[PDB]
Structure formats: structure tokens, C-alpha cells
Symmetry: C3
Amino acid sequence: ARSDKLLYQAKLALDEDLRLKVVRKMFELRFGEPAPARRSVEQLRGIEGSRVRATYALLAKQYGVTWNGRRYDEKGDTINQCISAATSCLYGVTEAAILAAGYAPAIGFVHTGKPLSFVYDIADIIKFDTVVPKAFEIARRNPGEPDREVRLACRDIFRSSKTLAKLIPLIEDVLAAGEIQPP
Amino acid sequence: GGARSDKLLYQAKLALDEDLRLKVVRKMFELRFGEPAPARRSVEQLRGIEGSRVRATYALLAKQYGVTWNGRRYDTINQCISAATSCLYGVTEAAILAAGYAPAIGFVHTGKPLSFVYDIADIIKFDTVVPKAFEIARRNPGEPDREVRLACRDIFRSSKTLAKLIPLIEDVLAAGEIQPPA
Amino acid sequence: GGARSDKLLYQAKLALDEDLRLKVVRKMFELRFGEPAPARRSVEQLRGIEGSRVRATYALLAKQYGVTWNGRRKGDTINQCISAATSCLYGVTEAAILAAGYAPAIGFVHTGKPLSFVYDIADIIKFDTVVPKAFEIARRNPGEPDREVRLACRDIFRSSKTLAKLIPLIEDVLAAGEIQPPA
Ligand SMILES: O=S([O-])[O-]
Ligand SMILES: O=S([O-])[O-]
């Protein structure tokens, strides 16, 4: 049974038609919009990246934070340290959700080649709902230990929001967009 | 499917609730140190106490083995410690994955992809593995990494380290006093 | 103690016993090179023999494809291509190990990283088509070596049924310890 899940995910990830269907669904869930037609996975990654750049810049204004772009070496200025703390917290739960669904964190679609490539793919869909805003909220608060405050706040988001449980069907929905009968 | 997901939901329940997390961290402390965690200390405070005890243990080993030492830094001694702990982290990560848990959902260490690996490995690492690294560094051998690898294989085989890790993981999580899944 | 625990305990028994591990490594060598390793060689010595044969194979491939070659290492275009190809193969190899029910971190030739066994299994087959493909693409002087090589390697894995064929190879490699396989 776990083998069947892994073989399904790998099938999707290795077929260019199926990979694009999955990436299109990731885009659709991220933005609430059908993915633009006649665009490759690389083109969709570029469009997502320019929208994300714009989202960070708007959040910076909305929280009064000085900002030129996302940048980090865990370490950086306060805001970038906060964002890293928050997204790393989310990567942990996202990995648990991927494992819960029987899939491999390492086998991605938009991201590839790293231990958490599929984690990056999935976390990116939802990270702007509350996780990245919370990083900006903490940075603006400027508390004594901002990374710890981010961790505390994100653990509470995931506990209260049932993030893990909700991610599991989301991951299955993303893969089901390949239109291959799921396990 | 359902069983598989239930293990992860249990681990996350424990890790995301500040009260439950502290129960797990206090159990880890007691297993590691052979005495209870000080009362009225947060996980952050316990992490600092652990860190000071770890610095003291490295100091004591360096003094006993007669090895030059200026703290943990990620010459020969730090290379040997890294080789030894990497060996331990691999069998710990494998045990965690096989137990059905997520390596990234930790308790003392939180937010790196291997946080729970560090938590579990840290319970046992100073018993034999780190002392062995000192013994080998002190010999100043021609191939220290290989010597450390072979010694660590022998420690894990002779100590039944893997067979013990899986119940250890369950014992630690069970300290949250939530019903484990099937 | 359950099927997954049982498989891990089997793989770890093999990997931690110096005699069993050498039997496993000798099987890996035979599958890789199509002949038995020399008598009384240690794993370390066999790793060295593999290294020298690999150095020679890269040199031959460079000559055959007309690619400038200054050795294995962003680096030069050929090293970028080899790295993209082998990274792609690692992903499929990890999926195969996980599907077989075994641990990516518990290796035989390579030991001590989260992907040591992945590196062992990948090395058995990587010179069949994956590394030659890296040389073929490098010879085109691609502006996008990572993208082009991964496209090409996904097609190799899809068309060759690489993941499915790796599963029995992994099981056979472990079987060479002459310990009764699980269940
Ligand atoms: O546009 S900013 O000043 O809120
Ligand atoms: O220290 S080990 O050999 O039990």
C-alpha cells in the first residue's frame, strides 16, 4: 500500500503532461484562478514568483516594515528572520502531512532535487494565508525574542486551524489533478 | 492509510500543544540525564540547561582524554565528533521514519528538517558515541573518519541501538499522556 | 514488531555487521561492473577501485562526446549537467528505496548521510544511460543545463520503468548478505 502511493506520485512527477497538470492545480489553489493556458511549468513558476514578490512588498507596507525583497543567508534582518522562522515551522507540519498521505517529501513538481522539494511545493500554496502575515505581525511588534514568538504563534495557528489534517486532502487533490486514478 | 496518518496526527498533537510538548521535553530530559527536569522551567529554559550540561560534558571529556578543546565547532576532535554524530543521526532518522513519525516535528529542537532526530539522538549520544570520538581523536589516527565509522557500527551493533530506538521514541511521546494510535 | 520495523532491522543488521556489509558491497560491485571484485578487498578498497574506474569512465565519455573535461567537481557546463542528471536519479532512487520499504540513510559503500543508501543504489546504474545523457546534452552547449538534463532524465526513467526495476535490484542487493529476507 505505501508503495502504491509512492509509485503514483513518481508516475505523476516523471510524465511531462501529468507534471504540468499537477503544477497547474498547485497554481490554481494558490491563487484562486485557473492557471493560464499554454504556459509551461517554468513559466508558471515565474508568474508565481512575480506575484509572490508583489505580495511580500504589500505586506511590508501593511505592517510598516522596511523592505527591498526576501533575503537571507535562518539569519538576516528581523523581518527576514521572522519569515524564515515561520516558513520553517510550516515546512515541518507540511512534511508530516505529506508523510501522512504516504508520499515522499523529496519528489516535487515545481521544486525538485532537494529533500523537501514537495514540501516547498505544498507549503507555498497556503503560506500566505496566516503564516507569512504572522511573521510580519511579529516583526512589527519587535519583541525581545522574535523567532521564538513566531514559533509560538505558528504552533498555535497549526493547532487551532488543524493545518495538518487539512493539508492531507489538499495534497491528494493536487495529485488527483493528473487525472490518473488515485490509489 | 488511516493508521499511517494517525501516528503523525498524534506526534503533531503533542508537538503543537505547549503543555503536551513540555511533558515530552521533561521525559526526554529525565531519560538523558537520569534525573528530573527542574520545575517551572519552559522548554526554552530547559534547552538552555541542556546546553550548559552539554558544554560541561564536552569539557569533562576533553580534560579526561587529554584532547585540545575550544568548544564545539561545526581540529581533529570536531571532525571526529561530526563523523560520529552523523552516524547516529542516520540510524535515528531511519528509526523515526520507520516508527511512522516525521523527522521535522520536534520538541526541544524545533524548525529544522531533522529537529526530532536531534531530540532523540541527544538522549543517547553522550553515552558511548561522543566519548568514542574523543578516544579516537586522542589517538591522532591516519584515517580518523573511517575509524569513527567503524567504531560507531560496532557500538550500534553491540548495543542493539536501533532495536532500542523505536520503543524509546514511543516512550518519549507517551509521556504526553494522550492515547497512542494503533 | 511490524513489517516496516522488520525491514529496517534487516537493512541495519546487514549495514552494521562488517561481514554482511562486505557481502552486500561485493554484490553492488558485481552489478555495477559485471564481474566479481578482487579477492580480500575491504569496502574501503572497493570504494577506491570504483573511484578509479569512474574517473576513467568520465574521461572516455568526454572523448566519445567531444566534451572538454577537467575532471569531476556552479562549475563548468558538463559538471552542471552531470549534477542535474545524478540529482534526478537520486530522486527516483529514493522513491524506489522508500517503495521497497527501506531506509535512504542506511548505506554500505556510502555511510553517514541521510541519503547514503540512495547514493549506493544510484551508483550501480547511473553510468548506463543517465551520465551518458548528461554528456550528450553538455555537447549541445545548453543555456539551461539543469532544465534540459532533468527533462531528458525524467523521460529515461518513465520510458525505462527505472523506479519499478530498481525495486527488485534493491532487494537483491540486500539479499546478498545471505540473511533470510523479510517478511
Ligand atoms: O504605503 S505605506 O506608507 O503604508
Ligand atoms: O559501547 S558498545 O560497544 O556497547
